[PDB]
Amino acid sequence: TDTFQMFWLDYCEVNNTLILFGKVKLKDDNCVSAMVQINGLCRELFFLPREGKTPTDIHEEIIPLLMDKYGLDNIRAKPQKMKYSFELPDIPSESDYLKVLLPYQTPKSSRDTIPSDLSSDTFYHVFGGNSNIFESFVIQNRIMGPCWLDIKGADFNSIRNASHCAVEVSVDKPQNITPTTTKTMPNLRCLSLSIQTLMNPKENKQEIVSITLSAYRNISLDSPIPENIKPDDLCTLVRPPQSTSFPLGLAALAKQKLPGRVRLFNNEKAMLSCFCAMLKVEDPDVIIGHRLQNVYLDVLAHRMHDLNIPTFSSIGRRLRRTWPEKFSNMNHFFISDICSGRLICDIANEMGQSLTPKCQSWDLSEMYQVTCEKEHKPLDIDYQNPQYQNDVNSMTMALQENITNCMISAEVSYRIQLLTLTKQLTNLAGNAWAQTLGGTRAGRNEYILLHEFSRNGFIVPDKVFEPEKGLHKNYVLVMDFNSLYPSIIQEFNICFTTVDRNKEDIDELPSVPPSEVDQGVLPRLLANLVDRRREVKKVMKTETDPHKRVQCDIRQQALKLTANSMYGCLGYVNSRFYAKPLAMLVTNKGREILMNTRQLAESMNLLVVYGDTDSVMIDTGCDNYADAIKIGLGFKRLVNERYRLLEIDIDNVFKKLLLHAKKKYAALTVNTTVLEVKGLDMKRREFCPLSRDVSIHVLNTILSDKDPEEALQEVYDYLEDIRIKVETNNIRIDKYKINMKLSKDPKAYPGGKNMPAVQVALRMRKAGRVVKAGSVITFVITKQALSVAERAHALNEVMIKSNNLIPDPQYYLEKQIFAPVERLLER
């Protein structure tokens, strides 16, 4: 009521200040964007006194020297008792440090940081010298992810023309900002982007041809997001891929065939200028897309740089007139920085992939099928193909393809709940939402410990069973063992605080602490996450309201993911909290448990088909779903009885299983039984529809509910019928077709005599027709000595009977039918 309130989403660093971007509510209950410039932030340095000296001795030595070097009239400093329990050898468990507050903003040498190994006769180590400004703020003020912030003493007249936000304010000190307990959040303005590019052979540059923008202005994460939500505004921007003008009648045809607005531009520079203007006015909190992080944002950024778009900064929320001077492998940092203020929701990055394990390539069409169970056949659009510069039909189809991708990306991101889950993960880890969305696990792993330890007066550090190959005729269950390590850490009280280890030699194996030692920080945290998860699952059993129930499920998953990710803290080599002695201690107990899990399985007359620290596959010996699940639960109880904290679950159910490796198999999963293939090249372009039809039919018959002979004879009968059908050419010519795209001119292909597509193309040239880079050649290997490449002819030519061209039975029965079936039907 007296304080400025804001829901913070993202941040950036500039001039040793911390800017928070967020939302503010207006008198009409509508939320607009806002930014807060936070001054007066300081590093918390801790100086460790030598055995004889004291914190006061330190005060008298460096405070004057620090004042002079940084040009400060005074420096807040006081003794403080802190604890250390990490990897540095000669630092005691508890000591009296001199806590020093060094402002990020200093008159002199602000950019220079104090090294940990600063020479002195009063102290021999210094912590926090290289602290990050965002890290300091978040830790000192106990900020746990995106939330509401009470900001007192906000200055509404200090900041001028600094952002693309509606409200700009500042504070003189970070203590003026505190988090509130409000559990709800404001609606987000989401903007889905789809970009189509053009490869420029001359400069090897990726240029932009079109951009589609789909706006969703009131996405609410408090309630579930309605399926197939329609955008409030849809707009497509485009420029000519070849000439300076479009085909005739494009605008009229677009108005007639395409949804939303379509804006035409004479060049790319005008299009990108318009794009930036639209971002500014739309002011999205979230930018959704497919492969934005590692592909399209880089293209977009560099093209804006190339064409010198003055309003490029609107991609983020901080206003810049110039690009970073060094804008190289560190382009990712510059782009990430310039986007600050708008969250990047990329369904195809590491974070997005982790939520969609059922995928394999994570292509837009594949994800749409997996997550939404809807089919969309992708069109390969190559704007090098001249047809787009003159054929108005072609252009319209291309734009339609872009518009569809833009809305599929949005729908997928809502369906897999990428925003709400990452938010919960961010609230649990206390890091930045953007870091969760675009980073690995390491980030979340790091901040959850930074918060836990600093809250309990601790100084934090400075920044297998081989697969049984073959067909399994009985139900096989994949048992989830992801809680293995976190249950080990908890059971055996493994922590940085409890395990004595040789810090001189990290290869020396330590021992688990005796029961007398109190629960450490890491096990206590894991125990809590596990308890909170139960508190939520209990509530679900009673909850009737689907809205609250769905919210519970999200919270529940978030807690599970946080706990199952804790091992990375001490396991990952490049972790701020890496500890090899601890990693070894947890990995060894992991082997003991899995080895015994095998014996437990065999004690139930079960066979382990495959296993690792993440999952164990067991053959139930049953040919019935009900029987199989009962066996699964029995094994679940058996494993929990021997390991009270280890709770495993049934992840997959294979009625039949053809196994090669963990991610290379074919099987009938149960959710209704369905065919599921993994790690096997099924939809490979090298193979024609006939070969794919045959391979599919072969699998279905093997995994069929029939005996081996009567079913395998069905295969032989099928192949024989196929062979006679091929030899007598009674199959549709389409089924023999093979596609092959030309990346360059067929004449410029070195070794084109071996490539069937290059031969077909060159033949079309010598005739008269035109074919350049970007043309897809569809051909058939015809019967005739001539090479296979010389016997290859365009599909449409073989379709005409008067041409007397027939498919070569030898090639198709051998290379297209025998070879694939041989690799599939071996065991």
Numbering used by the authors: 349 to 675, 680 to 815, 848 to 1055, 1063 to 1175, 1186 to 1228
Give sentences from the paper.
In contrast, the Pol α/primase complex produces longer, composite RNA-DNA primers that result from the concerted enzymatic activities of primase and Pol α. We have determined crystal structures of the catalytic core (349–1258; 910 amino acids) of yeast Pol α in unliganded form (apo), bound to an RNA primer/DNA template duplex (binary complex) and in a productive complex with RNA primer/DNA template and incoming dGTP (ternary complex).
Further insight as to the possible structural basis for a termination mechanism can be obtained by comparing the structures of isolated and actively copying Pol α, which reveals a striking difference in the position of the thumb domain. In order to adopt the conformation observed in ternary complex, the thumb domain of Pol α must rotate inwards by about 20°, a large conformational rearrangement compared for instance with the limited movement of the thumb domain observed in structures of isolated and copying RB69 Pol. In comparison, the structure of the isolated polymerase displays considerable conformational fluctuations, indicative of large-scale conformational changes and local loss of secondary structure that affect in particular the N-amino terminal region and the thumb domain.
